[PDB]
From a paper:
Many NLR proteins nucleate the “inflammasome”—a large macromolecular complex that triggers inflammatory cell death and cytokine secretion in response to microbial or danger-associated ligands. Like many other supramolecular assemblies in the human innate immune system, the inflammasome complex relies on homotypic and heterotypic interactions between the death domains (DDs) to initiate, amplify, and propagate pyroptotic signaling. Inflammasome sensor NLRs can be grouped into two categories based on their DDs: PYRIN domain (PYD) and caspase activation and recruitment domain (CARD), both domains were found to form filamentous complexes to initiate the inflammasome formation. Extending this analysis, we also found that specific type II interface motifs directly dictate the compatibility of heterotypic pairwise CARD-CARD interactions among NLRP1, CARD8, NLRC4, ASC, and CASP1.
To extend these results beyond NLRP1 and CARD8 and test the predictive power of our model, we examined a third CARD-containing NLR sensor, NLRC4. To unambiguously assign the Type II interface residues of human NLRC4-CARD, we determined its filament structure at 3.3 Å using cryo-EM. The final polished structure closely agrees with previously published findings. Interestingly, unlike NLRP1-CARD and CARD8-CARD, the strong density bridge in the Type II interface is absent within NLRC4-CARD filaments. The Type IIb tyrosine residue (Tyr78) is folded backward toward the hydrophobic core and does not participate in intermolecular Type II interaction. Instead, two nearby small residues, Asn77 and Gln82, come forward to form a class of Type II junction that is more flexible than that of NLRP1 and CARD8. Molecular docking predicted that NLRC4 Type IIb surface would be structurally compatible with both ASC-CARD and CASP1-CARD. This was validated using the in vitro EMSA assay (lanes 6–7 in both panels) and in 293 T cells. Overexpressed NLRC4-CARD nucleated the formation of both ASC-GFP and CASP1 C285G-GFP specks, as well as ASC-CARD-GFP and CASP1-CARD-GFP filaments at similar levels. The versatility of human NLRC4-CARD is in agreement with previous studies on murine Nlrc4.
Author numbering:
A (entry chain E), B (entry chain D), C (entry chain K), D (entry chain A), E (entry chain B), F (entry chain H), ...: 1 to 85
Write the structure that this text describes.
């Protein structure tokens, strides 16, 4: 998805860890990620690094995994998604 | 197997180390690889190089070792395998 | 011991760090490991990597070091050992 | 660009990793670098080595890629760029 | 092809190994090179020597193999190809 | 032995250096080779050349030295030996 | 065979050593050459000299040995053989 | 010493780097090795290669240097030495 | 200094990282080390490796740099220095 | 310069890679070395070999290039230069 | 040209291979040398021998080919050319 | 000197390259060898060949050059020299 690439400069800045901890779960429910990638992402200290791991690990998993991330991104932390349009 | 050769341009890009660490184990269980090749593959830094070592070391071990790699590739990181068809 | 090899696919998944921190000590008491290997294993972040280091470092120390690991594995975290049979 | 060459003695000293992690992203957005060079640069330990890789990999990519690096260097870590003139 | 010959003074200087590792793959997919030439080229240390081996091994394989190299050179490391015109 | 000659086209292709490093040792234990031939074989870069040196240096040492090579070849890297029959 | 004679001006130029190392093997399997001629050809430095020795040593061994050389030349380094027609 | 030669098949497999890092020091104290050989051995990645360098560099330094290696081998990693008898 | 060499077997074991972090600073104040060596030593995980880097980097800087290290070693972590005599 | 020749026995021993990485840069700024010699020197593993390459490549570039090396050697790692007088 | 003859005692000593690898290329661009002479010169081990081949093969190719060699010698490795006047 | 001749059977076996790299330097300091012989000896792969070149090149340079070689042989790698008496 181009929408993630073009705004990934701002996505690694104003996202927040507290919403990452939820997006990773909603992704784990839909059988996109296994447990090891959650244990690797969720253990980092600075949330910007987790943003790097998630953004870089979703652009690798085709384009169908982008839509799920976008819905799970507009459910939690909606003001950012509405602000970015 | 032709399926690996024809898609090996994309397999060395969107694979990921975290799933390689499991594929190498599932291969080690079935007596395909010995320990030294695991110690050689698992010590590299960039995951693309590990993808090169695995892809280049499976095309050498006949064609029966391809099917096991394909099963262990469709168990972990299924969205890539489903996307590639 | 074959019992570790045949189930090492599941041992690197459902083990847990909190029991590794005890198994390493019970091994350190019986003069199997020295301190440097404990400092190397206990400093890793993801517990699966510690499981890899322990499982790969016990299959190297003969077969007598397997029984001690099995006893220290059935004392703490007994439901896993009972479930695996 | 001569400005980078003449001050590259000081650019590999007072730069810092935390700003490199942003410069690499702002470069990745503008289709200058691909992902593999980011995975190679961002994995090094000492920030001076990352400064060597970036400075040596930009002087090779013509002169138009120097101006973008200079803008992305004057946005983040402005006091260094203002101090160097 | 004359375009490679006339600019091969600059192609062995500002190319980089990280893009060679991809060009060799995209060439290996199209049945141009076999595995042994990849094992000979990819094992050299200084990237300039790999540039010598590739540039000297493509001018020998007719002119039809030049176009594929040029496309695979404008996909990865595009700023160099655009700068060289 | 005819079995080595008739399949030596495929033995110099799908063998691998990592198993050569063990076969040379298992040969060195049984007083077949001295150290200088190990220092000559183990220093080459491309594994195919080491395959040439070993295959060409065993057909010279009678036929009794073939059986040891075959056993040491079916212990490590068994899938190749089983595939070749 | 006239096809080798008429194009031997270009065969001693764009052939390459890396394919000679395979053609000599595929010839040695079919009991065409003995080992001493392989030890004579494979020890030369410039690949053009090996091309001279091989091309001059095949035109002497009748015409039936030309067809095998042509097949082994169209298996490895096919783009040259297809380009030369 | 024959004891090292006859069991060097197993010594290059189940030794481990973590004990090599200590054996090299205990050897460096007794003026057996100088610093350059320590810098050559300690920089390798796979521990099996370090085992090769140490085992091959001790069989060259007479037989008196074997006893020190055996004592320093039975102090650290004692279960291996006791298992090997 | 001979005192460091003769006890370097025990200095790389019972030293500790928490005192290394202070010795490196007290050395940096007296213009013995520059910043890059501090960034190289302080980034290692196991404290024994830092002990190796410091002990091996002081025996290279003459003998006058030994006395400062000994004073800075008897200020912090005094019981070890008093125990070693 | 005689001062380098007469002390080159000790300069290839107690120098260190960490200061070589800076001397090569300060030399690269003053248009003494080009990039290829830096890529050749900086890629070696053991620092003693880099000391050999630098010391042997400076005694070839006249005597005016010795003074610059001496200044850049007395700026970083001053205690060695002061100890050697 | 007399300038090469009178100083060829010093040109075969302080030149270096790393600059020869570039001078041969800059000569190959201007249609002075063909590929076979580059394959003959570039394959020698000691750089002094390459200096002998180049210096002896340029004094044979008239005097117009000397000026190009002098320019390509003053572009790379300038301190030698400036020192020799 | 007879001592070198009578033990040169064992000197070409248990010497090692790592000490040759120092003996050649200590010889170069005392104006015994020039640089070209160092470039000839130090470029060989198998250390036994370097032992052949050094041992055969010292028996030619009178007998006074033997004592220097013997001292430089008893400084580095002392256990061999003490074992050989």
């Amino acid at each position: 998805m181009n929408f993630i690439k073009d705004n990934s400069r701002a996505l690694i800045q104003r996202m927040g860890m507290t919403v990452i901890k939820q997006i990773t779960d909603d992704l784990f429910v839909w059988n996109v990620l296994n447990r090891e990638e959650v244990n690797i992402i969720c253990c980092e200290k600075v949330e910007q690094d987790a943003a790097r791991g998630i953004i870089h690990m979703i652009l690798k998993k085709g384009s169908e995994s982008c839509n799920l991330f976008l819905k799970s991104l507009k459910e939690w932390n909606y003001p950012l998604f509405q602000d970015l349009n």
